[PDB]
Design a protein around this motif. Structure first.
Motif, PDB file in Angstrom:
ATOM      1  N   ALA A  11     -11.828  -1.668 103.387  1.00  0.00           N
ATOM      2  CA  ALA A  11     -11.044  -1.754 104.617  1.00  0.00           C
ATOM      3  C   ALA A  11      -9.623  -2.247 104.346  1.00  0.00           C
ATOM      4  CB  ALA A  11     -11.721  -2.652 105.627  1.00  0.00           C
ATOM      5  N   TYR A  12      -8.661  -1.501 104.863  1.00  0.00           N
ATOM      6  CA  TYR A  12      -7.264  -1.747 104.572  1.00  0.00           C
ATOM      7  C   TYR A  12      -6.516  -1.974 105.876  1.00  0.00           C
ATOM      8  CZ  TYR A  12      -8.679  -0.265  99.916  1.00  0.00           C
ATOM      9  OH  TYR A  12      -9.322  -0.174  98.693  1.00  0.00           O
ATOM     10  N   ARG A  13      -5.355  -2.598 105.751  1.00  0.00           N
ATOM     11  CA  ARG A  13      -4.466  -2.843 106.868  1.00  0.00           C
ATOM     12  C   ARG A  13      -3.052  -2.666 106.360  1.00  0.00           C
ATOM     13  NH1 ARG A  13      -8.676  -4.182 109.016  1.00  0.00           N
ATOM     14  NH2 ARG A  13      -9.955  -6.075 108.926  1.00  0.00           N
ATOM     15  N   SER A  14      -2.216  -2.082 107.202  1.00  0.00           N
ATOM     16  CA  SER A  14      -0.801  -1.971 106.922  1.00  0.00           C
ATOM     17  C   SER A  14      -0.104  -3.242 107.391  1.00  0.00           C
ATOM     18  CB  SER A  14      -0.232  -0.735 107.618  1.00  0.00           C
ATOM     19  OG  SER A  14       1.183  -0.701 107.515  1.00  0.00           O
ATOM     20  N   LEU A  15       0.736  -3.813 106.534  1.00  0.00           N
ATOM     21  CA  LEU A  15       1.425  -5.064 106.813  1.00  0.00           C
ATOM     22  C   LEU A  15       2.919  -4.843 106.755  1.00  0.00           C
ATOM     23  CD1 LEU A  15      -1.338  -6.297 106.554  1.00  0.00           C
ATOM     24  CD2 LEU A  15      -0.557  -7.677 104.586  1.00  0.00           C
ATOM     25  N   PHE A  16       3.644  -5.460 107.682  1.00  0.00           N
ATOM     26  CA  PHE A  16       5.056  -5.752 107.467  1.00  0.00           C
ATOM     27  C   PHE A  16       5.334  -7.189 107.882  1.00  0.00           C
ATOM     28  CE2 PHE A  16       9.642  -5.879 107.864  1.00  0.00           C
ATOM     29  CZ  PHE A  16      10.058  -5.112 106.770  1.00  0.00           C
ATOM     30  N   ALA A  17       6.049  -7.896 107.013  1.00  0.00           N
ATOM     31  CA  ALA A  17       6.442  -9.279 107.220  1.00  0.00           C
ATOM     32  C   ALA A  17       7.942  -9.360 107.002  1.00  0.00           C
ATOM     33  CB  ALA A  17       5.696 -10.224 106.267  1.00  0.00           C
ATOM     34  N   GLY A  18       8.638 -10.016 107.920  1.00  0.00           N
ATOM     35  CA  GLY A  18      10.076 -10.081 107.808  1.00  0.00           C
ATOM     36  C   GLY A  18      10.662 -11.040 108.815  1.00  0.00           C
ATOM     37  N   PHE A  19      11.981 -11.109 108.797  1.00  0.00           N
ATOM     38  CA  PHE A  19      12.683 -12.056 109.629  1.00  0.00           C
ATOM     39  C   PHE A  19      14.091 -11.522 109.847  1.00  0.00           C
ATOM     40  CE2 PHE A  19      12.700 -13.548 105.178  1.00  0.00           C
ATOM     41  CZ  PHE A  19      14.069 -13.526 104.901  1.00  0.00           C
ATOM     42  N   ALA A  20      14.768 -12.081 110.844  1.00  0.00           N
ATOM     43  CA  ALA A  20      16.068 -11.590 111.269  1.00  0.00           C
ATOM     44  C   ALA A  20      16.722 -12.669 112.123  1.00  0.00           C
ATOM     45  CB  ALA A  20      15.934 -10.267 112.049  1.00  0.00           C
ATOM     46  N   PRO A  21      18.068 -12.694 112.201  1.00  0.00           N
ATOM     47  CA  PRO A  21      19.017 -11.908 111.397  1.00  0.00           C
ATOM     48  C   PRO A  21      19.139 -12.458 109.977  1.00  0.00           C
ATOM     49  CG  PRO A  21      20.027 -12.779 113.422  1.00  0.00           C
ATOM     50  CD  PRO A  21      18.767 -13.550 113.169  1.00  0.00           C
ATOM     51  N   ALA A  22      19.411 -11.592 108.996  1.00  0.00           N
ATOM     52  CA  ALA A  22      19.332 -11.978 107.583  1.00  0.00           C
ATOM     53  C   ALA A  22      20.287 -13.110 107.211  1.00  0.00           C
ATOM     54  CB  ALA A  22      19.598 -10.768 106.696  1.00  0.00           C
ATOM     55  N   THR A  23      21.404 -13.260 107.926  1.00  0.00           N
ATOM     56  CA  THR A  23      22.412 -14.240 107.538  1.00  0.00           C
ATOM     57  C   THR A  23      22.312 -15.563 108.290  1.00  0.00           C
ATOM     58  OG1 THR A  23      24.166 -13.608 109.106  1.00  0.00           O
ATOM     59  CG2 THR A  23      23.894 -12.242 107.094  1.00  0.00           C
ATOM     60  N   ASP A  24      21.519 -15.631 109.365  1.00  0.00           N
ATOM     61  CA  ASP A  24      21.178 -16.901 110.014  1.00  0.00           C
ATOM     62  C   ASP A  24      19.842 -16.713 110.727  1.00  0.00           C
ATOM     63  OD1 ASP A  24      22.755 -19.088 112.568  1.00  0.00           O
ATOM     64  OD2 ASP A  24      21.052 -19.413 111.207  1.00  0.00           O
ATOM     65  N   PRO A  25      18.746 -16.614 109.960  1.00  0.00           N
ATOM     66  CA  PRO A  25      17.471 -16.135 110.523  1.00  0.00           C
ATOM     67  C   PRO A  25      16.971 -16.986 111.675  1.00  0.00           C
ATOM     68  CG  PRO A  25      17.387 -16.231 108.104  1.00  0.00           C
ATOM     69  CD  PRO A  25      18.627 -16.966 108.532  1.00  0.00           C
ATOM     70  N   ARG A  26      16.423 -16.301 112.682  1.00  0.00           N
ATOM     71  CA  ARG A  26      15.901 -16.939 113.883  1.00  0.00           C
ATOM     72  C   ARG A  26      14.418 -16.694 114.090  1.00  0.00           C
ATOM     73  NH1 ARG A  26      19.561 -17.861 118.030  1.00  0.00           N
ATOM     74  NH2 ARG A  26      17.650 -18.493 119.140  1.00  0.00           N
ATOM     75  N   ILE A  27      13.936 -15.511 113.729  1.00  0.00           N
ATOM     76  CA  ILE A  27      12.603 -15.036 114.062  1.00  0.00           C
ATOM     77  C   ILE A  27      11.963 -14.516 112.787  1.00  0.00           C
ATOM     78  CG2 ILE A  27      11.268 -13.332 115.339  1.00  0.00           C
ATOM     79  CD1 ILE A  27      13.407 -13.155 117.386  1.00  0.00           C
ATOM     80  N   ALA A  28      10.720 -14.906 112.540  1.00  0.00           N
ATOM     81  CA  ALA A  28       9.863 -14.226 111.588  1.00  0.00           C
ATOM     82  C   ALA A  28       8.764 -13.493 112.359  1.00  0.00           C
ATOM     83  CB  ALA A  28       9.265 -15.200 110.568  1.00  0.00           C
ATOM     84  N   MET A  29       8.351 -12.351 111.820  1.00  0.00           N
ATOM     85  CA  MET A  29       7.390 -11.487 112.478  1.00  0.00           C
ATOM     86  C   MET A  29       6.451 -10.934 111.425  1.00  0.00           C
ATOM     87  SD  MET A  29       8.273  -8.137 114.822  1.00  0.00           S
ATOM     88  CE  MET A  29       9.465  -9.201 115.649  1.00  0.00           C
ATOM     89  N   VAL A  30       5.170 -10.840 111.771  1.00  0.00           N
ATOM     90  CA  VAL A  30       4.173 -10.179 110.935  1.00  0.00           C
ATOM     91  C   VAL A  30       3.468  -9.127 111.784  1.00  0.00           C
ATOM     92  CG1 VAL A  30       1.981 -10.490 109.743  1.00  0.00           C
ATOM     93  CG2 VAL A  30       3.881 -12.007 109.247  1.00  0.00           C
ATOM     94  N   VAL A  31       3.406  -7.883 111.276  1.00  0.00           N
ATOM     95  CA  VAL A  31       2.745  -6.761 111.949  1.00  0.00           C
ATOM     96  C   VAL A  31       1.537  -6.344 111.125  1.00  0.00           C
ATOM     97  CG1 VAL A  31       2.944  -4.502 112.972  1.00  0.00           C
ATOM     98  CG2 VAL A  31       4.994  -5.894 112.840  1.00  0.00           C
ATOM     99  N   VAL A  32       0.366  -6.320 111.762  1.00  0.00           N
ATOM    100  CA  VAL A  32      -0.899  -5.933 111.134  1.00  0.00           C
ATOM    101  C   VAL A  32      -1.486  -4.773 111.929  1.00  0.00           C
ATOM    102  CG1 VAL A  32      -3.156  -6.710 110.295  1.00  0.00           C
ATOM    103  CG2 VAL A  32      -1.254  -8.339 110.438  1.00  0.00           C
ATOM    104  N   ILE A  33      -1.670  -3.635 111.270  1.00  0.00           N
ATOM    105  CA  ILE A  33      -2.300  -2.471 111.881  1.00  0.00           C
ATOM    106  C   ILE A  33      -3.451  -2.030 110.977  1.00  0.00           C
ATOM    107  CG2 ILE A  33      -2.000  -0.056 112.489  1.00  0.00           C
ATOM    108  CD1 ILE A  33       1.024  -1.031 113.186  1.00  0.00           C
ATOM    109  N   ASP A  34      -4.682  -2.116 111.496  1.00  0.00           N
ATOM    110  CA  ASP A  34      -5.867  -1.755 110.726  1.00  0.00           C
ATOM    111  C   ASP A  34      -5.926  -0.242 110.544  1.00  0.00           C
ATOM    112  OD1 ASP A  34      -8.207  -4.287 112.109  1.00  0.00           O
ATOM    113  OD2 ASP A  34      -6.061  -4.424 111.593  1.00  0.00           O
TER     114      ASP A  34
END
Ligand SMILES: *C(=O)N1C[C@H](NOS(=O)(=O)O)CC[C@H]1C(N)=O
Length: 463
Positions: A413-436
């Protein structure tokens, strides 16, 4: 026992999420009811109960002196009943919970049991704050860290993405990297807590906190943080990954894109080379990589006290052979949740300072721990921004208006992941997306992050 009004749960801005609403319960003294027994069919009828079933219950509880007839009527349905003047049929003034945002925030908020006791999510995790004592003094208002605007945006976009890529389940986590607040936590499938007579147990799962997976290439930034802190690796240093495979005694490490020879450290993240990250891992040792991963919270207790929340496992082998050294460095020798992964990216985005997770509104930010040195964290930030901006990078995760940073991966069983944050020069938000599943999720990161930053009036840094 005179039940207490239950504390209002709002979102961070005061939008109501769980509301204690007065209802009327009708109860009855069976002994008194055997007296007015030609009244039973009318009572049964006005209760919607079968006359013989109703009569059987009363007859069965002939000894007892207290039974429930119906719980939770509106104050003029119960008013209509007692207005029928049945001997032995009285009133108890209770409170029922209603969840105005419904399935949008179901898993975070949770719900109460038939007796108005917290049974899932925030309703359980903060039951004592919310309850107060029966008689009777009322419970206390609670403002979640959730931003219902961001929550609804994440909910809507995640459900669309599942409908696009034919996927069934998934989750999305949004966090304030500066305060530790969980701004959004949404799972698919979800459920309506106002009508949970008929809800499958799979939709009850708070996947973001319960579904444990090997994070794969999304922890390469942390392996790379260990590399930059060892002192043996600068960003422009070179690793040769030709021909995209690497034999470890018996095991063979294999890259997905086997089109390179020399890669600098940023190149290893852009092309997401398991060969390059392993070679670096051999050079620096797995202890350093385990240490960064543990320090950012991967496989550790989040300390939210959330019901059902799982911890995963970051095994401390103390001494690692070459195969376990590489498998840790490219993310398959550990298990994490979406919430832990987002907290880790928060720490990386917050210049290496981890602020403790919070599901309630943070007015006074607690001091964080410098878990990754600010120079290393800012370096890895730039590399992850290159993973999104650069040629051959995850272009579908670019956020128009801002500079975003991030890393895709395949979890297992696999899941697609994206992990990131924004804005790159003064980051405010981190986000993780998981889609099975049976770069699916980089577009969702893009859409949801574009809206989240705009909802938070974060000025564009791409100027
Ligand atoms: C990471 O999850 N992996 C390494 C490699 N990276 O590709 S990605 O940028 O699309 O994540 C391929 C997938 C996975 C792996 N199977 O080792």
């Amino acid at each position: 026992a005179i039940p207490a009004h239950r504390g209002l749960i709002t979102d961070r801005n005061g939008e109501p999420l769980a509301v204690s609403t007065p209802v009327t319960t009708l109860w009855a003294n069976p002994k008194e009811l055997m007296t007015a027994k030609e009244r039973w069919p009318q009572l049964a009828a006005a209760l919607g109960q079968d006359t013989k079933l109703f009569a059987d219950r009363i007859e069965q509880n002939a000894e007892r002196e207290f039974i429930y007839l119906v719980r939770g009527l509106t104050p003029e349905q119960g008013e209509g009943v007692i207005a029928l003047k049945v001997p032995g049929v009285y009133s108890i003034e209770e409170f029922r919970r209603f969840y105005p945002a419904g399935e949008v925030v179901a898993h975070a908020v949770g719900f109460t049991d038939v007796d108005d006791r917290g049974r899932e999510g925030i309703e359980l995790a903060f039951d004592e704050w919310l309850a107060g004592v029966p008689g009777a003094k009322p419970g206390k208002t609670l403002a979640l860290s959730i931003d219902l605007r961001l929550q609804y945006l994440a909910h809507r976009e995640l459900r669309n993405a599942l409908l696009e890529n034919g996927a069934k389940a998934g989750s999305l986590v949004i966090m304030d990297v500066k305060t530790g607040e969980i701004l959004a936590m949404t799972n698919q499938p979800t459920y309506n807590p106002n009508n949970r007579r008929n809800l499958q147990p799979a939709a009850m799962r708070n996947r973001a906190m319960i579904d444990v997976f090997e994070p794969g290439s999304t922890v390469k930034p942390f392996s790379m943080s260990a590399a930059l802190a060892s002192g043996r690796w600068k960003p422009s240093d070179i690793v040769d990954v030709y021909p995209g495979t690497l034999q470890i005694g018996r095991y063979t490490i294999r890259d997905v894109s086997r089109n390179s020879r020399q890669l600098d450290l940023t190149g290893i993240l852009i092309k997401s080379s398991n060969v390059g990250i392993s070679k670096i891992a051999f050079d620096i040792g797995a202890e350093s990589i385990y240490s960064v991963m543990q320090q950012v919270g991967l496989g550790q207790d989040t300390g939210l006290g959330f019901p059902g929340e799982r911890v995963g496992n970051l095994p401390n082998h103390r001494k690692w052979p070459k195969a376990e050294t590489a498998t840790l460095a490219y993310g398959y020798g550990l298990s994490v949740t979406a919430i832990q992964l987002a907290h880790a990216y928060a720490a990386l985005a917050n210049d290496g300072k981890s602020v403790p997770l919070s599901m309630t509104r943070v007015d006074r930010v607690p001091d964080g721990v410098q878990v990754i040195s600010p120079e290393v964290a800012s370096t890895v930030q730039g590399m992850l921004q290159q993973v999104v901006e650069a040629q051959g990078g995850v272009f579908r995760a670019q956020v128009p208006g801002y500079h975003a940073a991030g890393k895709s991966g395949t979890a297992r069983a696999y899941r697609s992941l994206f992990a990131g944050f924004a804005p790159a020069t003064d980051p405010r938000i981190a986000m993780v997306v998981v889609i099975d599943e049976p770069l699916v999720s980089a577009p969702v990161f893009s859409k949801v992050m574009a809206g989240a930053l705009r909802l938070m009036n974060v000025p564009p840094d791409n100027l």
